[PDB]
């Protein structure tokens, strides 16, 4: 469900804390930035 996915994203993304609140938009912003960071880590 939605809140399980958001919690998992906080666990997986190392720029987000886990147990203090973060806006869901700022969560997804960090997710986008982290996905780009990992894609670049592999390929130019």
């Amino acid at each position: 469900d939605m809140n399980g996915c958001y919690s998992r994203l906080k666990e997986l993304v190392p720029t987000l804390p886990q147990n203090r609140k973060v806006s869901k938009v700022e969560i997804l912003q960090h997710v986008i930035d982290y996905i780009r960071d990992l894609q670049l880590e592999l390929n130019s």
Copy 2:
């Protein structure tokens, strides 16, 4: 070279474009988008190091 900030609508749009398993045209729910995002992050993480 993107450092753009997105709102909620923009975030879900950008995630559909970033995540290769998400169709940019299909009628996917927000929870479905996040489920694909989670599995994709995990795959990327597993490809980083050994």
